[PDB]
Amino acid sequence: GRRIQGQRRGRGTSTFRAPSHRYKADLEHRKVEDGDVIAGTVVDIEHDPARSAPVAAVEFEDGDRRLILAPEGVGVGDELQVGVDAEIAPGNTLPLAEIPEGVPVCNVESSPGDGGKFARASGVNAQLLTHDRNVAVVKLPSGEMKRLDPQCRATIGVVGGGGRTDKPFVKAGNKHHKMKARGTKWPNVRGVAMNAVDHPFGGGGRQHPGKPKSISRNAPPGRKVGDIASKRTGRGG
RNA sequence: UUCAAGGGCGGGGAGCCAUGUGGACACGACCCGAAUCCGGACGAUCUACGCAUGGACAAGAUGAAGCGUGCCGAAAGGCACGUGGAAGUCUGUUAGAGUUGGUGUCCUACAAUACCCUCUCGUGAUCUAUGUGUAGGGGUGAAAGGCCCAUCGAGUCCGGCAACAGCUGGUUCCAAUCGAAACAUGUCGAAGCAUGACCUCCGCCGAGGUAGUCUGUGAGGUAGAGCGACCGAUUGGU
RNA sequence: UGAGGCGCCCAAAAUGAUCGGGACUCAAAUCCACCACCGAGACCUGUCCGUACCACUCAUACUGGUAAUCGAGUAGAUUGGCGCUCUAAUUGGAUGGAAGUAGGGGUGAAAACUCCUAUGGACCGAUUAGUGACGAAAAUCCUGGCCAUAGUAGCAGCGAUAGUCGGGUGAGAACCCCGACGGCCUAAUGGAUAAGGGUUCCUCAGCACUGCUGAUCAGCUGAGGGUUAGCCGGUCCUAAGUCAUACCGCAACUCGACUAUGACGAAAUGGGAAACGGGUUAAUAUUCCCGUGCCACUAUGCAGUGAAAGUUGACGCCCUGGGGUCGAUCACGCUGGGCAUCGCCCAGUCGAACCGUCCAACUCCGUGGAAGCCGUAAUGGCAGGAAGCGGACGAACGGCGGCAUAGGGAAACGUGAUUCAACCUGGGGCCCAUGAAAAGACGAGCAUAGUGUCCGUACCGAGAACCGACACAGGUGUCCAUGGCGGCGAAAGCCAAGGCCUGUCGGGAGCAACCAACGUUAGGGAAUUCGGCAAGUUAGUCCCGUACCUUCGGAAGAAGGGAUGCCUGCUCCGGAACGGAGCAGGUCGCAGUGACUCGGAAGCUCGGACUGUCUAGUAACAACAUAGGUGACCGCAAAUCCGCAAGGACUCGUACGGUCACUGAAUCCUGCCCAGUGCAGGUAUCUGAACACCUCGUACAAGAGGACGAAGGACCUGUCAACGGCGGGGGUCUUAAGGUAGCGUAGUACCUUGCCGCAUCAGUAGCGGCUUGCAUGAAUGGAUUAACCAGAGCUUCACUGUCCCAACGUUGGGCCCGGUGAACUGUACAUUCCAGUGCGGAGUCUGGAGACACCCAGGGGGAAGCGAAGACCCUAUGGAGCUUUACUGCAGGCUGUCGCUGAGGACUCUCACUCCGGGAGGAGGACACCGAUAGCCGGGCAGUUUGACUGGGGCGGUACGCGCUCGAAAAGAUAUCGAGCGCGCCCUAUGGCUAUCUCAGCCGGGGACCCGGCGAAGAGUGCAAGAGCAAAAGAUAGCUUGACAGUGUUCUUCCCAACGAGGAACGCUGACGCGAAAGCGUGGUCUAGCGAACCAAUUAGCCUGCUUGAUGCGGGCAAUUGAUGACAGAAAAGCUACCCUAGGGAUAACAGAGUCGUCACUCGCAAGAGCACAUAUCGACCGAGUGGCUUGCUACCUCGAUGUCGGUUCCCUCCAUCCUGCCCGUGCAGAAGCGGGCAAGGGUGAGGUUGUUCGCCUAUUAAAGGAGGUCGUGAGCUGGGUUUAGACCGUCGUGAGACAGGUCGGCUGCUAUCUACUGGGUGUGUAGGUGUCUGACAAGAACGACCGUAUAGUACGAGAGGAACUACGGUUGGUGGCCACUGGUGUACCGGUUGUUCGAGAGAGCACGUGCCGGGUAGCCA
Ligand SMILES: [Cl-]
Ligand SMILES: [Cl-]
Ligand SMILES: [Cl-]
Ligand SMILES: [Cl-]
Ligand SMILES: [K+]
Ligand SMILES: [Mg+2]
Ligand SMILES: [Mg+2]
Ligand SMILES: [Mg+2]
Ligand SMILES: [Mg+2]
Ligand SMILES: [Mg+2]
Ligand SMILES: [Mg+2]
Ligand SMILES: [Mg+2]
Ligand SMILES: [Mg+2]
Ligand SMILES: [Mg+2]
Ligand SMILES: [Mg+2]
Ligand SMILES: [Mg+2]
Ligand SMILES: [Mg+2]
Ligand SMILES: [Mg+2]
Ligand SMILES: [Mg+2]
Ligand SMILES: [Mg+2]
Ligand SMILES: [Mg+2]
Ligand SMILES: [Mg+2]
Ligand SMILES: [Mg+2]
Ligand SMILES: [Mg+2]
Ligand SMILES: [Mg+2]
Ligand SMILES: [Mg+2]
Ligand SMILES: [Mg+2]
Ligand SMILES: [Mg+2]
Ligand SMILES: [Mg+2]
Ligand SMILES: [Mg+2]
Ligand SMILES: [Mg+2]
Ligand SMILES: [Mg+2]
Ligand SMILES: [Mg+2]
Ligand SMILES: [Mg+2]
Ligand SMILES: [Mg+2]
Ligand SMILES: [Mg+2]
Ligand SMILES: [Mg+2]
Ligand SMILES: [Mg+2]
Ligand SMILES: [Mg+2]
Ligand SMILES: [Mg+2]
Ligand SMILES: [Mg+2]
Ligand SMILES: [Mg+2]
Ligand SMILES: [Mg+2]
Ligand SMILES: [Mg+2]
Ligand SMILES: [Mg+2]
Ligand SMILES: [Mg+2]
Ligand SMILES: [Mg+2]
Ligand SMILES: [Mg+2]
Ligand SMILES: [Mg+2]
Ligand SMILES: [Mg+2]
Ligand SMILES: [Mg+2]
Ligand SMILES: [Mg+2]
Ligand SMILES: [Mg+2]
Ligand SMILES: [Mg+2]
Ligand SMILES: [Mg+2]
Ligand SMILES: [Mg+2]
Ligand SMILES: [Mg+2]
Ligand SMILES: [Mg+2]
Ligand SMILES: [Mg+2]
Ligand SMILES: [Mg+2]
Ligand SMILES: [Mg+2]
Ligand SMILES: [Mg+2]
Ligand SMILES: [Mg+2]
Ligand SMILES: [Mg+2]
Ligand SMILES: [Mg+2]
Ligand SMILES: [Mg+2]
Ligand SMILES: [Mg+2]
Ligand SMILES: [Mg+2]
Ligand SMILES: [Mg+2]
Ligand SMILES: [Mg+2]
Ligand SMILES: [Mg+2]
Ligand SMILES: [Mg+2]
Ligand SMILES: [Mg+2]
Ligand SMILES: [Mg+2]
Ligand SMILES: [Mg+2]
Ligand SMILES: [Mg+2]
Ligand SMILES: [Mg+2]
Ligand SMILES: [Mg+2]
Ligand SMILES: [Mg+2]
Ligand code: NA
Ligand code: NA
Ligand code: NA
Ligand code: NA
Ligand code: NA
Ligand code: NA
Ligand code: NA
Ligand code: NA
Ligand code: NA
Ligand code: NA
Ligand code: NA
Ligand code: NA
Ligand code: NA
Ligand code: NA
Ligand code: NA
Ligand code: NA
Ligand code: NA
Ligand code: NA
Ligand code: NA
Ligand code: NA
Ligand code: NA
Ligand code: NA
Ligand code: NA
Ligand code: NA
Ligand code: NA
Ligand code: NA
Ligand code: NA
Ligand code: NA
Ligand code: NA
Ligand code: NA
Ligand code: NA
Ligand code: NA
Ligand code: NA
Ligand code: NA
């Protein structure tokens, strides 16, 4: 047959790429020699085309002007701080060690200095539960308990834009406009609506998948489609 | 080979080379004939989808939120009027896009997809110019196996290549002699082969042969007939 | 009363009857005899030829002889010869004329040889031996040329119908030019341009080419000429993105991703230093000239120390205010023009860049001090300080002044206003969407001077300059969107400016038929049709008014009702409009949205929620998408995906993410099943590879075995919004459950037109109810649903030429004429018709009939017409796409092991290595990554296979290897999917031998046993069938292992007649058994019970392995065992309607043909009933037939195609007669019937459901018959159904996909050569003329039928009821003709009237070939 859509994706052609040239900034925690002295002032609040969420423009003491992953509650004029000795207020960034347990956090680093990897989408947040000299236990938005180096930096507060998912798109056109700002091919044709040559579920006198939808983890690309290594399906039980 | 016996193969000197010619096998193999498969290249001037930068949409209708005023109310708010001008909203041959019916005209066309009337959309998932990206078992696809330059259930060009076929077509001067088989055995075999039958030509052998009839010595259970001769059918009566 | 001969009845078919025809009757028939003739290539006979043989011979050279016993022939075998090229030897010809060609003479059976004459003008042979790109009628053969076709089609069709009269030039003028008149184009047919073209531009000279005709013209031909830039573009910048170098990869590169660097990337249409006005050429022009202005750089000078922060460049979508120019319009004046019943109408009234100046909006400052005011179109603003007042900053392509006694104008060379494109500047709203960048500019003064190079520049820009082969009705971007009237309008219609008469052939006929577009049609009004297809109706605006339903938005312009012009005078809103809304009065028409523009409406059902997408080119839909619902995977060093690698997309992303799937808005809901399959988790035990390890083996090694055991599997569990399932039976079984809410004859229901109801005269339709559902059902989503829809079905009102039933007219063709000028097609012949025959579908054969030739027009009956090597079907050891638990492999994932890899069955560490960090350092860590290998998964991908037989193929079957009886025709052989039926073993005895013995069955005496008797065989002998057997081949007893080893002969397998395995018969050699012995035993009494090579194992001995010896382990001779049943041996599944090729009428579907079981009809006999009575009527059984309409069979004809069903239209026919005429019988009173005979003249109609044929139903009727003509009729129509590609449902399948199931959508080519006929001409024959006739023959349905009245309330009859002859009147169908009458048309004509233009008036053009409306003569018509 022919390569399935999931395979056309990997080639990285225009249709599947994100409109990167249209994006604003790569949100990452600033690098501080040490001391924490680094502070800056919020100069403006902008829309982030790559996240459909707000982002904050900050002017730092040493002249640096960078966009920041903005938590909820940050406004023009506010003074944000980044460092070990940073105050403990929303919008500030400091290592999980210096953060008091029980505080909501966002843009958490996977490993100290990577600039932030977890909890960055609209309205989400991580939960610093346990401390230690060796391990900082954080509960990610998926609900997982993650063990992180207490040296991993994070930002106090929940990400701005919460509740975005509460409103329905209502019409195809609205999805369209959002999809145009992401690295995604849309709309989506169902596999069962295709021909056998184009998809493992394609073909037939009526529409239905050929075999069962749960596919093995070991299935090769071109065949791994449907419910991937599903531990279970449906809702019952 | 073999206790043994019995079998197999060979044996009393003709070959080698040359020239012409009959035939076989490999090769293009008497000639043409088609759908393939594979390799390397050339194409996104068409078209699909994405991206960059530009452009386009008479006029009218309906009248969302918001806001105002007035009246009612303790408040909550409610009601009326106005304002406001939303919408993959309506009408619309504005421009522009599309293409339902006529199964009209055309059908050696004006045209290898045209003409006319009718019809759908026309502020949006909109239409469009130019630039730009994705390339062949690969793209692209709101998915019709659609589209990738009149080419698509795997583009185009050249090459492999004089592809192969048991299948169709064709195979060019005169005469004399003989003269079939359309059957049997085997076959992935029944549109084909091989081996026999049968046709023909050459060399050898050297006296019988037997298509006809008669007679003699033998073989035979079909026609017919019959079954108180088997067998099995098949009537009635004392 | 028996028999015979000939005939008769029985006896019906489709274009025109037949015995071949004519025609024949004491025969030209038939039967019995007879006589004479005709008549082949046979037979006889003369001569010759060939072939074979004989004599002679070297001879196959002669000569003679023989053939009664020689003379046909496809495929094929054999043999002699003719012709072509060039070579060689030998030898000739030719300018006193070679070859070739044309015509002609001679020879040879012939291939072919040769001569003569003409032409030709230089080469040409013969013999012998060679040579070979050596011989054509054919291949839908190749190339070239040519005829018919044909002076034919086209040069008409398009909403752009375009010309005409004079004149100019010229050899020549319908189309080249001038004038007038008449028209066409208005977002274009005008103006400016991008791309693209490339000289097409201008001039002169031309017409052989091109130009749909002609041409003096030209985009043609030839020759010259033409494009001028500091301030228009390029150039410069950067965009998506591209390239180059470096690095790395790769076997390698012209290959490849990342990361650096550098460069490239925008001519209309991104950003951007600077130009305006006039003038000029045949052709350029912000480029040249004149005038004026401006920018940048550099130099000089003065000023200036400032100078880089910031601003700008620089930005989305929607609504909106203000500023404001051009344009347009209004008022008034001036200048010029037009008109001439008024006094109107038209044009103009000008003047740049630039320099200077002015400034609304926004923002801000001071003052002020609002507690309710301020302000807007709207939102809004304020004690955090409103209004007012004063001030800073601050706009136009705008105002104003200069520029300008510049320029331009014949002249005047204006002033105000409104609405205001451009341009400027604000306010508001929206985003799960956030709307470039860089160069550059500003910031940052002035004088003077110098410099400003390089590339582009013509023209077209399209119904002739571009792409489409063309001067192609197609395609192709931007700007002018502000010309007038009109009106909502960038709409229509009309008209300016500007352009054009080149969407480039004309002339003629009242101009016929027929065709394309189209107008109008009385009365009826969907009767048409699959279906209202097509056409029509409605229509603009205002007022009134508006149902069910609903997601409260909508439905809605629902529906329905009314109004609408002009003129006179006014009112209101507003600053006003040349803006809008009203009032009163007058008044005309058939009609006031008067043309134009401009909805028909309502209801029920199905589907998909909606806008959107799609098969470029037959499908626009119910299919795809969608929001919404849901499940799955993943914490980012992730999940998913691309790459061989280096690397990469997702990702400037991070679970409110994004990947992978299913369902498909809302509403109410979404039951039961985990057995199978899938996925996932767990797992004592079982299974589970390689390395390392242990044992055996080998001086080593191969190899055998063990221990350990990863993933995986077994096993257990979870999971269905995972694949999917939800029955039979009874008051459980398969296999887990056993169909819940719902819905239901469904787009799913076979039976089926289900039943009931609604509706209609009538309704296979539609809707509602019922519903046992062939075979409904819950995210394979169920039900339901407002809104929406070029989606499917149905109903109503309205409408109407769809129909009854057609007519007239309009325009373009058609027809005739000038000019231009193809194609298709062609074996030949061809004036055919009716029959027959033939490979069964003939212009050509046969018999007849008809037929004088040529030509014009026509509609297409035939040439199984032309077009296409059939798409259907089968066949091929064909192809391809697709599928899967087909075969075999290959990626990829998981997992063990080895290397990298290090220190001290579980553990720590750090040093490689990996990741994070700028670094310091942090995390991880001998793991991971990578390299190698092993096991598991693995249609993700590749290559292939998937057999044959067969009354086509498939399904079924196996007649695919064997044995018997019959078929089988008394030797042998013999077919079918022929009839009956068996074998793929079983047996250590059920083998072998010997001894003893005789069986079934019946009878008699004491179904066991005992005795006797009869008893040739019916018993028994393993198993089919047939055969054999009695002191045995059977039974009993005993003994024995010959069911032995080796090797042959022969037959069979395979008749004849080659062929293996296998089988059998009969020997021998050896060894045995039994018997006194002869002898028997080569398994079972005989015919079924069977298997190659390669490989392995096994048996006994021997041969052999590369210089050699020893050991190990191999190779071989003979043979046994292991299976290929498709059985003389491949290792092997499907779909294709997305399909493709080779072929086949070797083979199916359709038509034909044969048959006639089936079907239709008839006859013989006549049981029977019919109150009695076979035969008024009905009529069984059985028997004999006819037809060729149904069905089936067959496979003859066509697969290089004979176009399907149904319908329609138009023609002919048959009779087995439905009506009509004439008759017979009656269970015939009459009337009304029933049945029958003759008979085919005429008639046999209209409708409702259905694609239907058929059939059901309704009302009429004299009756509403059946059948043939290729199931008549697609070069006639239609296209509803069957049967392409799209899709849905049900069922089946793991799946692709399928269905003798349903459903929505889904194309109709061609210019007529021949023939045929309808009509029209020209000739010839009869044999100069006029007029009038004749009539061989030919055609007709020219007439068919019904109702009514008198007869008559009569005959008949109890009555009820109720005829006839004849004479009349009328109707219907058909037929021919005609137009006084009625009616239609009537783009002759006359009137009314809307819009616009000619100034008004008058009078006119256009509005599609009449603007519309009203009337309508002639003619033509019903
Ligand atoms: Cl999303
Ligand atoms: Cl000869
Ligand atoms: Cl230019
Ligand atoms: Cl405003
Ligand atoms: K055929
Ligand atoms: Mg980032
Ligand atoms: Mg919305
Ligand atoms: Mg995208
Ligand atoms: Mg979808
Ligand atoms: Mg599909
Ligand atoms: Mg597949
Ligand atoms: Mg579905
Ligand atoms: Mg489904
Ligand atoms: Mg392009
Ligand atoms: Mg309003
Ligand atoms: Mg709309
Ligand atoms: Mg519209
Ligand atoms: Mg493009
Ligand atoms: Mg398909
Ligand atoms: Mg010959
Ligand atoms: Mg001869
Ligand atoms: Mg016999
Ligand atoms: Mg007999
Ligand atoms: Mg002969
Ligand atoms: Mg010689
Ligand atoms: Mg031939
Ligand atoms: Mg002709
Ligand atoms: Mg005209
Ligand atoms: Mg010219
Ligand atoms: Mg000239
Ligand atoms: Mg550049
Ligand atoms: Mg520009
Ligand atoms: Mg010019
Ligand atoms: Mg020019
Ligand atoms: Mg033209
Ligand atoms: Mg009428
Ligand atoms: Mg009807
Ligand atoms: Mg009808
Ligand atoms: Mg219609
Ligand atoms: Mg007023
Ligand atoms: Mg009208
Ligand atoms: Mg239905
Ligand atoms: Mg839809
Ligand atoms: Mg199409
Ligand atoms: Mg459509
Ligand atoms: Mg279509
Ligand atoms: Mg759908
Ligand atoms: Mg969804
Ligand atoms: Mg979803
Ligand atoms: Mg019903
Ligand atoms: Mg369910
Ligand atoms: Mg064919
Ligand atoms: Mg087929
Ligand atoms: Mg294949
Ligand atoms: Mg790194
Ligand atoms: Mg495959
Ligand atoms: Mg192959
Ligand atoms: Mg077969
Ligand atoms: Mg015999
Ligand atoms: Mg025997
Ligand atoms: Mg083998
Ligand atoms: Mg063995
Ligand atoms: Mg065989
Ligand atoms: Mg055999
Ligand atoms: Mg074919
Ligand atoms: Mg045949
Ligand atoms: Mg035909
Ligand atoms: Mg009769
Ligand atoms: Mg008749
Ligand atoms: Mg027919
Ligand atoms: Mg007929
Ligand atoms: Mg026909
Ligand atoms: Mg046709
Ligand atoms: Mg035709
Ligand atoms: Mg149809
Ligand atoms: Mg239909
Ligand atoms: Mg249909
Ligand atoms: Mg004559
Ligand atoms: Mg007119
Ligand atoms: Na499927
Ligand atoms: Na192939
Ligand atoms: Na392109
Ligand atoms: Na309101
Ligand atoms: Na159309
Ligand atoms: Na390909
Ligand atoms: Na080739
Ligand atoms: Na082949
Ligand atoms: Na044969
Ligand atoms: Na055969
Ligand atoms: Na064959
Ligand atoms: Na003899
Ligand atoms: Na006989
Ligand atoms: Na022959
Ligand atoms: Na002309
Ligand atoms: Na106007
Ligand atoms: Na729309
Ligand atoms: Na299960
Ligand atoms: Na399961
Ligand atoms: Na079901
Ligand atoms: Na639509
Ligand atoms: Na008409
Ligand atoms: Na014809
Ligand atoms: Na294919
Ligand atoms: Na096979
Ligand atoms: Na044998
Ligand atoms: Na018959
Ligand atoms: Na044919
Ligand atoms: Na028909
Ligand atoms: Na008749
Ligand atoms: Na009917
Ligand atoms: Na036919
Ligand atoms: Na047709
Ligand atoms: Na038809």
Side-chain angles (χ1 to χ4, degrees):
Chain A
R2 300 159 76 192
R3 314 266 250 212
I4 66 174
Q5 182 159 288
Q7 289 180 291
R8 272 60 180 283
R9 271 187 79 227
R11 301 183 63 255
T13 52
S14 186
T15 303
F16 306 95
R17 270 185 258 137
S20 300
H21 58 291
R22 238 192 286 145
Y23 285 169
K24 294 185 183 179
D26 174 308
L27 311 170
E28 283 181 338
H29 298 316
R30 260 201 45 164
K31 304 167 187 176
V32 181
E33 327 78 278
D34 201 301
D36 144 66
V37 301
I38 287 301
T41 303
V42 178
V43 165
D44 194 12
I45 302 302
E46 321 188 18
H47 168 80
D48 184 351
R51 315 195 305 98
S52 287
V55 102
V58 177
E59 262 197 62
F60 285 89
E61 289 180 54
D62 56 311
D64 287 287
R65 169 60 180 290
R66 309 161 65 280
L67 281 183
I68 251 180
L69 180 9
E72 173 176 348
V74 174
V76 185
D78 294 44
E79 179 191 303
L80 305 176
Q81 311 183 309
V82 183
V84 184
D85 303 297
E87 201 181 82
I88 294 178
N92 280 46
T93 300
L94 40 176
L96 285 168
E98 308 307 311
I99 303 286
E101 323 186 324
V103 182
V105 181
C106 62
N107 197 24
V108 181
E109 305 191 302
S110 187
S111 95
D114 64 35
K117 307 282 191 193
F118 310 118
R120 332 211 329 163
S122 291
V124 303
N125 81 80
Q127 186 56 42
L128 181 58
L129 309 175
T130 298
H131 254 66
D132 194 299
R133 303 182 176 181
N134 298 294
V135 67
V137 179
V138 177
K139 178 183 184 184
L140 303 179
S142 75
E144 159 185 348
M145 302 294 265
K146 188 73 164 180
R147 300 178 117 266
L148 293 169
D149 190 303
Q151 210 49 46
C152 286
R153 301 203 259 62
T155 298
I156 302 175
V158 296
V159 180
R164 186 188 51 202
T165 284
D166 303 333
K167 195 179 188 184
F169 283 98
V170 186
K171 50 184 173 167
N174 289 350
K175 241 280 185 53
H176 175 99
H177 296 299
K178 179 187 188 187
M179 239 55 268
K180 195 163 184 179
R182 298 288 189 283
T184 294
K185 165 64 195 180
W186 182 88
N188 320 299
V189 176
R190 286 134 46 234
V192 162
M194 307 187 270
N195 285 313
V197 67
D198 289 318
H199 189 100
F201 291 177
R206 70 207 138 86
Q207 283 173 9
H208 62 124
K211 309 174 190 162
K213 302 187 304 177
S214 299
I215 190 75
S216 159
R217 244 286 128 55
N218 307 320
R223 180 188 178 196
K224 185 175 290 178
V225 301
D227 312 318
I228 302 172
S230 65
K231 304 183 199 70
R232 61 159 297 153
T233 58
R235 319 188 85 196

